[model samples]
Target chain A: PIATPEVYAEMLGQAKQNSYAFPAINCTSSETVNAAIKGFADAGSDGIIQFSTGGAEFGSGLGVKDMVTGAVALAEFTHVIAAKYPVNVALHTDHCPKDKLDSYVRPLLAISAQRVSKGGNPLFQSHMWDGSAVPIDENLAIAQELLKAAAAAKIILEIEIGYTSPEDFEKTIEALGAGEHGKYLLAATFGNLRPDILAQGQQVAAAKLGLPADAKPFDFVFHGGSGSLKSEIEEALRYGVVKMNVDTDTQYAFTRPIAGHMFTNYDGVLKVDGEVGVKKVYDPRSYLKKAEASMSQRVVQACNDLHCAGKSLT
Target chain B: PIATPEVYAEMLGQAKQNSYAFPAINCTSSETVNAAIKGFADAGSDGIIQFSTGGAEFGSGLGVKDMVTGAVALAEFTHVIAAKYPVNVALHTDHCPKDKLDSYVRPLLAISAQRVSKGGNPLFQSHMWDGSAVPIDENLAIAQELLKAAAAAKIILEIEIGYTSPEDFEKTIEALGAGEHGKYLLAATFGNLRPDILAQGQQVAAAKLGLPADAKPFDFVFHGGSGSLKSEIEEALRYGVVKMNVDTDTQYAFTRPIAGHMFTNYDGVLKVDGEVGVKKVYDPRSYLKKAEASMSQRVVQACNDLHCAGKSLT
Candidate 1:
């Protein structure tokens, strides 16, 4: 590992050869991240640490730094949690489009690495460079450039191939293998459909990247786990993939309980509770436990599907 | 009077033969006050004023001059639109309860009167001296004192006689007729009741404000218009009542469009269209105009109900 093994550095490398796929879960919201970490580590699991660009979106509104600070903070949180528990963690940026990848990701990864090097998180910063649209040759060039920069920064790099299109699963698989970039983690497309889409996608990615009919030998990465279902994660595991992602699913998990609380407990348009309305008026921390509980449930489900259970260092 | 002469000031000095009624109109939102003012002026109204005080149940969230500032701004807007508008506008503070009336009302009234006296759009401030809970003799003495202070300050004053119970209407009537005693306006409930439960509770207020069955000269003040309908406003007007204070009506009016906008345009999960959202998304004026336009319609409806059409100062 070069450049002082950044946030959860060891886990990103370990994930390359691991039997169970380590799912990269986003700790976008502060409350959910807090609970997700506490619960994830307690379960003795290696976790892929990531966060949303929402903090940057919020920052954009406030005319401040968008994504970088949050990356550092999420890495810090993972580092602290990993220090206390015997767990492997890899921090990755889920979706930085090809257009802003160099401008945003490299600088942020460098800063995060510096922080981690100076007694920061064990969670290494990695990224998915979305080049699913460009020609394969061009995409590979971008990937090579990114991977070089990533290695220089002591960061692991995840790369995607073959755009998802309707009526073509095997077409994408052929395209993925034809690219022939054997040195990187292969983020491949598999039908890219819906809730059941993730498991099938992982199968396609695993086949193209590692477990193809001809027996390819390379690392596999599964994307589009945002609204991914549990059955899909388990099915994807049968294909020998080692990383899963869960995004939109966690968002749903975060917001549903707040809606439930408002509808069932609150009486008026003003959200006046039957109890002391003034009690929790100011603190956002008041109902955050409910949000956290919702997120933890999703993490447990993700772990079960990835079959990463009993794979921790402890 | 160096400033604007109070409509009932001369009457307060000595028992006059006829007391022209001064109608109280509370424009809750910024947009609706124009219609309220035009309605009062068209009626040849003597006591046209605005006050913010919720009855026994809800306290006015805004304090004295804070409410008056917005009210004055609305009055100016109304004055600009109306031609030959002659309604003597009195800006009043209603319902200064015994606890903090003096401390809150005096300085606020002074500031308001100063603004009004520099006025083009009639800046009269009203103070509601609630005399129901106080003893009759002491209440009368306190009323006289407040009137003197208001007169010396060269502004307008309104005294309130609360109709505590349905049977206390006669006491309310007696309080209204006990002579003005330097007070510019007297508000008593004439025992009028609206259909809504909240308005029905307010019926207790109407009975005591001794409006003559045909010609009670004293200015009549109506309370509890929050839930009152247009039918109630019309019914109250039949007795030659000039001011119809409808605050909650306009409040509802302005907020409904905003509520609809938030529900339809943005995700209904959060109310992102408040001041902060307005500042972030686009031009501030357009955002405020949307809010003001909704409120302005309420003003028009209120003016129509008061039969103040085409009464302009052109």
Candidate 2:
């Protein structure tokens, strides 16, 4: 079932206490999202599926209202799927750039408000305020306003604390080139933190706001999880990380086998058991099924690694 | 502006009377749909932009309800763009197979019914019932039922007639193989009528349903016009072709430049004038805009050739 904000908060709190985090997959299409959901369900665990601004725009054909509308429909659809599979799924907007907050974020907030007015759950469990591009003070200021609105709507507000320096950003882009930047994170990973950085960043921000030290000031989301070492992930959770955003590695898992198959079976002459490219292995469903399988395997492995698999949702 | 069903029907009536047909573009995404809209606006002509079942599913992440809901949102969005560009834009569903009628088409019908009840226009101007695979009688029977629902909702009904013989189907598949069969139409085009076939199909169907020929029995949409000659399109229009579905040619017009540029600039070292390998030339927006221009040029040429250019909607 789709959890309420209180339930979702409790789930995140459980993750922090239990040293397990839901692997948030950046999904663009139904095939990809379904693949992620199937994997988590097979593992008997909870899951988080998110959409970036680009992903939502792609899915809704670049209309802001439609994107928000699409998100609501997507939430309802996932809830149906979750009911059958019995996985606690949280629908979220991955990264709303600061400039796009008004256009995309505001409308979603309104949808959540309207849903609440009718005594229903919000369309999204949470929304990330991705202001890592702006100054720290500006990012905080923007997030502060969003936090208030989010609290009113019973929606969680995710904010970023750290970013890559100019030198590392340049070098990473130079190393990876432009095309990879479109599919994978580049500058985003350079800021992947040590436990102290993660802890201190949240501590300082919470202190600046004069919040109690004993209170969990914020639900710290660990981004750039794909670039961090397993030990680093383990260490970050000890500090405060409850949710980890992973994309590049999962994307690689999805694409590599499909790409390998296309190159290997280019002539459609590859034999499978006793057949000569029987059923025409080049069919879209054939390659897409391979992609889904590969993605599912990676997601299952990630869940196990994150210690989320078999963690009791009840 | 987005035309109402009455307005769209009137436009089709005008096209049939004037011996010209609106060119319907099979659009899949924001970029492609925008290109089609801009093309007609540039030519000072009305336009029809359509989505196939596969296309809608792709755009809405494969949720049927979301796909239908997204279409309504997209129509409203286009109305805003159409007002600025000064063209009558018709949002349509290009093809919905007979088997999927209940799952996909029925909900759209329900939405349209609701819209009419609320004193608004139907969500779609017209929907094509693709029963080309079945026997002609079976095809007509299904279309007949849909026509009743459509008429009640004040929307147009577009249906196909004729079929490819078993021998021709086998020969086409033997020659072109199964992979190409999915991308291009085959047996569907066997029914690709000459003027006489076009006139007879409509006349017979109208008579069988006890409707007068002079009353505009239905809006006959000419599919697979990509394979027809210029004279054939003109003749088809005279016989009842109010809209010609042109995909292969328009797709080529959009993709050709992108493919050529990629091959020519494979090394990413091409110099433009004095600027060596300028970033401006390689940006995605740069190539995508070029595609829109090329596609717009082709659409404009098609409109001129079809005698649709400067054909006033008023």
Candidate 3:
């Protein structure tokens, strides 16, 4: 899938219309990236493949001395390999905390500008800045400046700051003058509540926040979302959570079968079948295929769970 | 290192001069490719990362409907990811048996031609044709014609037809006019013999083939080379083998620690830790880093064993 910004906005548009949310999976290495692509394409769904700061560095074999170089390498790798699959994916950077803005995040924006200057699309479709650790003034200032850069380069910018109440959420909305901005995504932190509780909380929120109960002002991103109840997922979908972050689910699926495969074939893969091992059985390709298949199955199930199956833009 | 034949010829020059051989490791997925690069670079060596017909198909996350697309995708991926590291690598295709020539091998040569036409290096540095199963006439004709294509594109061609007798070796050498072809690499199948027996066999070979005792007319490639005695590897180097194929050694190394990693962290990675998995512990990055580091250590050891460590031209 391509990683240009405004085009991905269209993908989010489709997610809302269909009442489904795409899986935003965090990948640490090349296999995870490939697995994510294969899983989404097999389910015929559009998805997001994201790299956290540490995850991107692992792509180059060793830790990168500087953060930007490793993330750039992975972004470049994904740009090339992701083209081979028959699904659209949004390339993203997962978490750039407040400490990493200048060293990691800003440099990436500069590189995206360079890519555009050379007659190419921006390197990333979107980036998540976790500026919650800092106070609102510094966080807002940095985010606003970077948002201008992102706007010029046609990139989407995401920032998260937990709100204690609906009033606090409105305070930031009014402060940024973004009450009616359709592109803004809200990630809910309800501390594992029942779906009934969420429904009740929002009934009063519409009146208190001065919106019609039918209004879906904020597109949502569901966090901590691996094994939540299916009803909870479907419930959040009705309220406009267009994407759910899913690292734990896919991570478990990837390692689960591999654990069993390695154990069952331990003698063959390790000692290589009685001194002169069977090359076919001992080969890395055989077992890794299992890992990929397992992970892909989980992704397919997740897609169906999110009501996102058969929704490829292509 | 650049995958063009003449420049790669220069890499072989450094290899022979340093009395070492680059490890030609077979890769089936993206992680294996990155591991080879990291391993070799860490040991201060340059190496070859290659794809067999089947291995190339796995990179696209499924069995490719046609042979050509998978290999092409992998070649494109290697071209992008290998540039991120400090080491030089020759992109190569492993064994293509006679039946695969029309469907697989020739199509790759055509793609290489397209790349060169676009003012780029050929996608592969070298290609191996295992035409051993066919008759001499048909095999020789195919090799001769493809060698012409390879010559034009500055790509090296490697062919193997296991010799039955010293006379059979001379018969083919005379038939093809390849007795003094310096770039030709002969893979010795000594049937796990001691180095002294190899010394004895080659002593007869130089005399039977009518070459001077000290003349090293053929470059050599050591096949079935993983876990061979250190003395055997060194002995073959003395007889002019400049590259060794290693799959099993690195393969076992890649999965061995992962087997343990998964088992030890089974609860965290599989069911995901008391039903609320620790994100850091269960992440695929934590375990796959074990895989990469383990495989890379094997590569480093292999480079040292082949006397190839610290032999990079850079």
Interface RMSD of each: 18.6, 9.0, 2.8
Q: Name every residue pair that clashes in candidate 2.
A: none
Model 2: residue B188 alpha-carbon error in angstroms: 10
Sorting all predicted structures by TM-score, with the top scorer first, yields 3, 2, 1
Error of 2 at A163 (Å): 9.6
The candidates' DockQ values read: 0.02, 0.06, 0.40
A1-314 per-residue lDDT for model 1 (tens digits)? 11134324344445444556776776543344445554465555767656546432221112122465445543443343344444555556766677666556777766655765686532355666777787656776777777765665556667766634322344444533423422346666665533334345545555655665533243567777655666766555554467777665665565545544434434322323453233231122223346556776777777766767666644
Where's the lowest-lDDT run of ten residues in candidate 2 chain B?
B178-187
iRMSD computed for candidate 2 = 9.0
User: What are the models' TM-scores?
Assistant: 0.43, 0.66, 0.87
lDDT of 1 at A241: 61
Q: Which structure among the candidates has the greatest DockQ?
A: 3
Compared with the true structure, the alpha-carbon lDDT of candidate 1 equals 0.48
Worst 10 residues of 3 chain B by lDDT: B175-184
DockQ of 1: 0.02
Model 1 stretches with alpha carbons more than 4 Å out: A1-18, A59-61, A77-82, A112-123, A163-183, A193-216, A226-231, A267-276, B1-314
